[PDB]
Amino acid sequence: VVYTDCTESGQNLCLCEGSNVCGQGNKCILGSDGEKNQCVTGEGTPKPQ
Secondary structure: OOOOOOOOOOEOOOOOOOOOOOOEOEOEEOOOOOOOOEEOOOOOEOOOO
């Protein structure tokens, strides 16, 4: 199953780290003092449609 590119930090099934998907149950972050995209575990949100 595929997702798509995040549209908001915190998500975790989107193309967070690179074109690779992060990890549901985790939390991604777009723009972190320079990191336009990080994949840091944590309760974020299942990037809805």
